[PDB]
């Protein structure tokens, strides 16, 4: 495993913790990285690192050094989980980002839910600002990654990383680019399921869905529709309806997003421009 100096970091100076997260393509682990923030080379940085499990594969080792790879590429951006550094050498990959503190974003908003509908937060209840602010700055985050030639192709609550400023963060690089077998059905365009195609307006259409989890406040796609059914359904023009507390101008928002053609979604640009306006008279 060849090293990459600019990004090396000592293992010496890095501390494990607690778990944070998991899967079958590896595990997210609490730790402290001494000096890892160059603006701050003292200072010790509470950080996540991404990790093999024991039970890995060669393919899980080979997509964890392209995951590493592909953060590389992104860059830096407010509403992007950023690379911090990696250890290659001598040891277990790490692969070390910044710490989101409130987890998920799925679970942020499901325990920030009204009563009536062990983790909740009650104090922190969301209101409907709070749930347009998290789509624009998502959509901001999007319109900078497609402006660096990146599809992410695995956009969803789950993939998105709350800080301890509930600033939203952008995560899980693992399926992105510069078959589409592995990608969620329900967060997929249909040109990416059927005619294995996949662009910045894939991209769109799976930023309706998470506009559509953000409005639940966290539910799930298509409820009670089996991904298996889920084929014919979007090919006969079905869409999901309206949450509660969206506003139909953020309802016709998702459905643009999920236009049939592509070419005729918006651009992340122009979401970021409407969602603008819509934050502004809130
Ligand atoms: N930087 C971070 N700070 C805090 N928690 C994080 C984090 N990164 C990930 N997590 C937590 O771990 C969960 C899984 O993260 P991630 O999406 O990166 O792994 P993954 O989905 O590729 C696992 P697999 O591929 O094996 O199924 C996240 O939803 C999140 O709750
Ligand atoms: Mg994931």
Not at 15 to 24: D, I, M, Q, V
Not at 115 to 123: D, F
Not at 234 to 244: F, I, Q, S, T, V
Not at 272 to 277: A, I, M, N, P
Request: with cysteine; glycine share 6%.
């Amino acid at each position: 495993l060849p090293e990459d100096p600019k990004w090396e970091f000592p293992r010496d100076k890095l501390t494990l913790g607690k778990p944070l997260g998991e899967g079958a393509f590896g595990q997210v682990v609490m730790a402290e990285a001494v000096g890892i923030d160059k603006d701050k080379p003292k200072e010790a940085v509470t950080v996540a690192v991404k990790m093999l499990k024991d039970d890995a594969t060669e393919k899980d080792l080979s997509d964890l050094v392209s995951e590493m790879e592909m953060m590389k590429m992104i860059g830096k951006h407010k509403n992007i989980i950023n690379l911090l550094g990696a250890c290659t050498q001598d040891g277990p990959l790490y692969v070390i980002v910044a710490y989101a503190s409130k987890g998920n974003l799925r679970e942020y908003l499901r325990a920030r839910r009204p009563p009536g509908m062990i983790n909740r937060v009650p104090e922190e209840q969301m209101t409907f600002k709070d749930l347009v602010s998290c789509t624009y700055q998502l959509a901001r985050g999007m319109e900078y990654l497609a402006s660096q030639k990146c599809i992410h192709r695995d956009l969803a609550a789950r993939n998105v990383l709350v800080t301890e400023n509930n600033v939203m963060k952008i995560a899980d690089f693992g399926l992105a680019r510069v078959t589409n077998g592995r990608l969620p059905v329900k967060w997929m365009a249909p040109e990416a399921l059927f005619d294995r195609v996949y662009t910045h307006q894939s991209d769109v259409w799976s930023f309706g869905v998470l506009m559509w989890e953000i409005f639940t406040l966290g539910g799930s796609p298509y409820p009670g529709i089996p991904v298996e059914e889920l084929f014919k359904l979007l090919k006969e023009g079905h869409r999901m309806d309206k949450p509660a507390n969206c506003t139909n101008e953020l309802y016709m928002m998702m459905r643009d997003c999920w236009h049939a053609v592509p070419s005729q979604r918006p651009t992340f640009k122009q979401l970021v421009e409407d969602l603008d306006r819509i934050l502004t008279l809130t």
